[PDB]
From a paper:
The products of flhDC operon, FlhD and FlhC, form a heterohexamer (D4C2) to bind to the upstream of class II promoters and promote class II genes transcription. Recently, two other proteins, FliT and [name], are recognized as negative regulators that prevent FlhD4C2 from binding to its target DNA by direct protein–protein interactions. Wada et al. demonstrated that Salmonella [name] functions as a novel anti-FlhD4C2 factor, which regulates bacterium motility and is responsible for nutritional control of the flagellum regulation in Salmonella. Our structure analyses combined with biochemistry studies and reconstruction of YdiV4–FlhD4C2 structure via negative staining electron microscopy provide a clear regulatory mechanism that stoichiometric binding of [name] to FlhD in the FlhD4C2 complex results in the opening of the ring-like structure of FlhD4C2 with consequent loss of DNA binding.
The final model of [name] contains two protein molecules (Mol A and Mol B) per asymmetric unit. Although [name] shares low-sequence identities with other [name] domain proteins (below 20% for the full length), the topology of the structures is the same. Particularly, the α8-helix of [name], which is essential for dimerization in other [name] structures, undergoes dramatic transformation. Notably, although [name] loses most of the residues coordinating with c-di-GMP, a similar groove that is responsible for c-di-GMP binding in other [name] structures is still retained. Electron density map clearly shows the existence of a phosphate and a glycerol molecule in this groove. The interaction style of [name]’s Mol A and Mol B is completely different from other dimerized [name] structures, such as Blrp1, YkuI, TBD1265, LapD and FimX. The Mol A and Mol B’s α8-helices, whose corresponding helices mediates the dimerization in Blrp1, YkuI, LapD and TBD1265 structures, are far away from each other. The interaction interface between the two monomers is also smaller than that of the standard [name] protein dimers.
Author numbering: 2 to 237
The structure:
């Protein structure tokens, strides 16, 4: 019941993911970590770098427990939740005879990775990712970040893919490149139905992105909310 809270305090937020009509369809679970005594906020990358494999599992478990605690809300409003997947947790899910089960029972919870995931360029040849994708919803959170190829996408590993804010904003800022978004979207859609656009941070960006008809959108227009205020995101 303590998980990682004896080492770092997790102050958790939900990033709203809304469809092209702004209806809430899911949330991404994020954490602002503080030191144990609360004196300083610690960058997530620095927290994650330190963790042993068991600590990686504890942090994952703490987040799972948080999401499980919201299960009635997620099911009732038909939403999904993104939970960060690290390779350390991947190994434990795949190689223990009793870790994979709890996650499985909550299918609204989806495993989120980024283009920096180890050996992502192997696509379906990444044994761990292939295996997890066989039973869990897998999401690539930052397609277009320029840190991997799309092999894993065309290999069919993902349930959803989100185009990174840097990619979306680059093509919208340099307006003549907007067709590049359309071409990328068209090519990916058969291999992954659900394409999401990040970086929707201004009214102008939303106006430009709406005609693309992405399944969902994420960005500063819909600020993070503390996890206990998730009810503020849906109809009263």
């Amino acid at each position: 019941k303590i998980f990682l809270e004896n080492l770092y305090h997790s102050d958790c937020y939900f990033l709203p993911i809304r469809d092209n009509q702004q209806v809430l369809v899911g949330v991404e679970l994020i954490t602002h970590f503080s030191s144990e005594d609360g004196t300083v906020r610690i960058p997530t990358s620095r927290v994650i770098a330190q963790l042993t494999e068991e600590q990686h599992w504890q942090l994952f478990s703490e987040q799972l427990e948080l999401l499980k605690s919201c299960q009635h809300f997620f099911i009732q409003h038909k939403l999904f939740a993104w939970l960060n997947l690290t390779p350390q947790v991947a190994t434990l899910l795949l190689e223990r005879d009793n870790y994979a089960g709890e996650l499985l029972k909550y299918p609204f919870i989806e495993l989120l990775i980024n283009e920096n995931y180890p050996h992502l360029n192997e696509g379906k040849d990444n044994r761990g990712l292939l295996s997890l994708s066989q039973v869990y919803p897998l999401v690539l959170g930052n397609l277009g970040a320029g840190n991997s190829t799309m092999k894993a996408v065309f290999d069919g590993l993902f349930t959803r893919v989100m185009l990174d804010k840097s990619f979306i904003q680059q093509q919208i800022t340099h307006r003549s490149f907007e067709p590049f978004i359309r071409a990328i979207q068209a090519q990916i859609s058969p291999c992954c139905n659900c394409i999401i656009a990040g970086g929707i941070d201004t009214a102008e960006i939303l106006a430009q992105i709406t005609p693309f008809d992405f399944h969902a959108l994420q960005g500063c227009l819909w600020p993070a909310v503390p996890i206990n205020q998730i009810t503020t995101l849906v109809q009263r």
